[PDB]
């Protein structure tokens, strides 16, 4: 088997306990991924009755609860986002390809819940055909990452209720053929389309920072330990409180490329201690990570766009250490507080 | 001192507390090793009486219990196995060079015990001569490892009661000269002599797997904390329950090279999910790791052989992750349950 | 032995592990080559057991995995192409000597595989007779090269599973007599039959470039490291992704000899920065390397022909350096992307 | 196009990111060069999403960061030096044609910076007209070389932010006509005007060495890897620490032609191991490479002059190997330490 | 200085750290060499304290460890061998000019060590007199080379502890006058005195091969990195394991000139694949490189002789490539394994 012999398909399921059928998979369900590590683990119970034996005994071993889940990396593309953003957030408003050009907005709501889905990891190679079905899956974490000379990546940590293996002849088997968007239909976001914008203190508008890389993690803090008597499976994947953290790498005392000057008082003079003072005084800043593809138009004059609005953000000490006689660089970590919004303007 | 200036010699001792003498060492006791890390550690006790002092004080420090032990790697050869297999297992039946050709079988028995031995790490170089004697030693762990373009290695984790240093002029000193088997007498096992065989479900016989590497660990779980008032030494090295684990690396959907087809129902059709289903359904499989040297005959038509019979084995999820568009490879871990047997057919 | 005393014969084998027999060689298997460098290498394993010895020891050395392969240069002729193009590409459609005159087309297909073959390098000279048989061979790389005052050359880099030596008296020996096409039957392509055609931007048709030389490499990126326990041989030669690169030498600001004008907007005015702008704007160009022999007719009015269609090609900076007061010449490297096709129209 | 059809023009630009316009070029900007190799390279990004495809595909490729730069060789002449010495060093004091006759002195200062410039490589030939503009250029390295029967050459390694192509009809195009100094106005330095002077230990003055050739490299160690999200271009060319190295070829045990005797104690007796002892004892020597043209007067009795003052220099082992029964010759490498000064006395 | 103005003298020193005095040099110490490249290198340490400075600073630079060594080429002659063979090998038995005629035998012993020596490279020319003394020198590598129309050459790679320069007036200076053997006393080995003999398989005796050239390298693998705190010098030159490799050039399928036929079964029929099969089957062969000067008698009927016995040798694939229609020639590389012996029968 080769990685090209395998397909990945997420499909949303009505109830957490009812896996999607392998015959319902259609266009839009199959995603091109960078790597998958979904797996299931069964727990083994050993009787505590003391017995003389040189080694473990089959008659006195039982198997207990099962876990399922793992990571999936994606290159954040057009259809990948269309499929995954609804699985990462609670509410969606609008349509990406809305003609007016405001796209779809994804937010976390007060008592919102995550959509459960079934992950199919199918294999069709010279050795044969079989599908790993992970049912009752939820996105536990989602990291957006942007590096130089790279694309925008999206790493999902998924928790599931259980795994099973479907093979030709099983009661729920269909010989599925993955269908993907055309090469001319699917688009990705590259590093040179990115813009990190910050605002703090009395700054009038968002000023663009020259960062080298950025990461943004949404962590839903699912409770993956709700077991009961009479079942080896998790009984739910209840979501806790969403923790939105992140990091971005940039120099010490950087000036803004565009927008106002980095100055907590809104003045025109640059503050070489801007981020350090933001971190030291516990100020709240507004971030905006924005990808714009001008070469792709969604409306009359509206380009493809992926904006992440993080109003109210608290930075840790920016980590600007004097390590050598060269340029002082560091990574500023941050935690988002009140809300996170994601607007995706895209045409399909 | 150089590593070539040193010798290693294990010798079996009647009682755990009576070290073997340095004059009893003879042919068969000295082993060629890859590396040794046997050492002793003394514990330092510091009085808790509160006293004003800028630093620790010699008058208020005592030294407590001592540990000894460490690792020794070997290239699993003819005489190395002859010497070490009796130290790793509880019972031996037969003789390796038995003319009929079934060799010696080493197994763990119900209430069996490990043989204690003394490890001599001797040095004889331009600087002088001295022996590190580790008395009351037992094999705590033993790992067999096979890699491609390598030999079969055996790593022993040894626990001992204590260490001492013998030097010219001590009451128990003898100027020992290590004697080793002739180059034409000693043989090793190479990777291309190895065969991993598996069996599960209704499979009729053992089918050979094409694995890239394998490891098998026997862990005797010695209790190394039995101290008493009136002695700085361990009072015993009581063995717990032997845990036999292992791992082997191979591809997803491997087909067997020889034997039947990998099929849990004994059919002739290949099952591309064989190991995954073995792990997911908690089935017990039979493994057999076997080295055969046809170029070395022990009987009329019986070749040198080292077989490790692991009936009843439980695999973890085989770890077949889609990491890249190339061949999907992974490592299947396993735990052995009821018994482990080791047959060594060898001529000396 | 002289190079004239040796023959070379490729023969296609059903399975990668079953070498072709030396008795199956017939007309069409024997090829006239410029030079061969096929060879096998055995790996030597040295025991890591530390031992005092001034030099390596025979008793403590083992031999490990084997590689085989090397290069073979051909003068791209009639029968050479007939034999080798099926070994370099995945799919073939048509017959070279098809009466209609479209020849055979060789392409890479989505999940296509390379044909394994056995290479016989036989020697029959005053010293005696013996054959080097390289079994399980695949074409790893194939370079087409055209220079002025030369013929079209084809250099193959071949990887194989192993080598063996056949001699009179061996179980698989036949006294083979090489049979070759008649001098009046075999034809080659000369430099003055070549045409390099390019197209980019809005150019309406392919415009001919005056190049001095060209090279085109197909690289199948075989995985030559798939070894296992129990075998010194490679277990497969799995092909990765085919990388098609190349280079052609020409002057700076060249005009086209025929076809439209080199103009990214399809106009009639020449663009002296055509290739530089193609490389700087990351445009995709279409190349066509075409050999035509009008003196050899395959159909009523169809000449012998070897066309290499490379639609979608990306040039690197054309390398037009001002080195001296003479004509500015340079080499434009390129990488092909979507597909490569090779049409061979030939009569045998 | 011929090398005579091309011109080269450097022009200093106010900010690193604002290229000089092609209409601002005037007398003094155009330089006669020996060879140019300025070029730009775009990086190509390949999506990591695993997909079945025989070859790279266009829809899944993006292009990333760009580099620009290359080498330019000059014959160190009057106006070439006037133009380039200000680009190689940090500070200039004086005017070459100062009547008093001390010329201009170029030095590296503590926190000094390099001047950014735009390099125009223009072509105007039978094929047409177009300019390669390399904007944001800095001198990364500068080598002065003197050989026998040659002129003094100056090789610049230049790093730039990016390249673009200007052509008739572009928004910033002007039909520039290169203007050069008259043949009777421009002068060069020949080998027979050179003098290498050394001083070490207690030597009272500088003693002239008879060297066969010399090289002196200034290396500014620019940081050419400062990229950010949202731009394919380098964000700066920050200069590190200037490393000034060099080499000169001469015979073993050479005596000085003029000045004192080569003697680390200032005595009149020659030391045949002078350079070897300077290198072995880690002594610091003072070098002075000086070109004087007596036939060209800049003041009443002051000739044209190019002096390179390298106080404090450390030689490596002079490389005086006995290779043959002839004269022992070798090359002494050196590293300059504290400061480097360059005085140019010239009339224009 | 000319190469004829210099002398070279090795002298054996009692301890590695005590250089031989320049007054102890006498007849037999001075050797005629082809070329020397002995040199010393001092390491320069740069403080890591970050400081603003355009260039390195003398106050913040220190110099560290020193290396010494280099190559010396000799024409393997009578006295050259007498002097150097004891420095290349561990043990010597016998005297070259022993009347019985078995000469001196040089071998590597189990725990043998190399003799340290001091190398004097003295210069006495019109410029003056001075000696380079390299103390604590050991032979790291020694290559014997034989070509057609050449003499037998011996290239030594020497590692030393340090270098110093002695000059008239130093505390250890003596005006040494080199004394050499008379022209009528010294003899060399020419190519036409050479014989390469091979034996493998069941061959009864050594059969002579017609080779074009040969090389044999002894490599002692000295550890040249044993430095300590408080010293800039190496603390030892500990020798590792001696690797004896070599190569000889010959034609493909060569027959033996004398001795038995090249046949792995001892038969009288020639095997055209002899060396290829020796390399492919991993057989061990016995080589013997032997120079005999019949015109020089050491005993009543015993001629001058230099034999290199290499029992047990493993050849790589002989490198017999079909490059052209002429005779197939190649080079067979080999590694010696168990022992190497060198017998020198010589009269002085």
Numbering used by the authors:
A (entry chain D), B (entry chain E), C (entry chain C), D (entry chain A), E (entry chain B): 1 to 348
Sentences from the paper on this structure:
Micrographs of purified P74-26 virions revealed flexible tails with a stacked ring pattern. The tube is helical, with a rise of 40.25 Å and a twist of −44.75°. This resolution allowed us to clearly observe every residue in the TTP from the N-terminus to the C-terminus. Using this reconstruction, we built an atomic model of the gp93 TTP de novo in its entirety, which we were able to trace unambiguously. The diameters of the outer and inner surface of the tube are ∼90 Å and ∼45 Å, respectively, consistent with other known tail tubes. The P74-26 tail tube, however, has a markedly smooth outer surface with no additional domains or protrusions. There is density that runs through the center of the tube, which presumably corresponds to the tail’s TMP, gp95.
The hyperthermophilic phage P74-26 is particularly intriguing as it has the longest tail of any known virus (nearly 1 μm) and is the most thermostable known phage. Each P74-26 TTP subunit consists of two β-sandwich domains: an N-terminal domain (domain 1) and a C-terminal domain (domain 2), connected by a linker. The interring interactions are mediated by a ball-and-socket–like geometry, wherein the tips of Loop1 and Loop2 each fit into a socket of a subunit in the adjacent ring; Socket1 and Socket2, respectively.
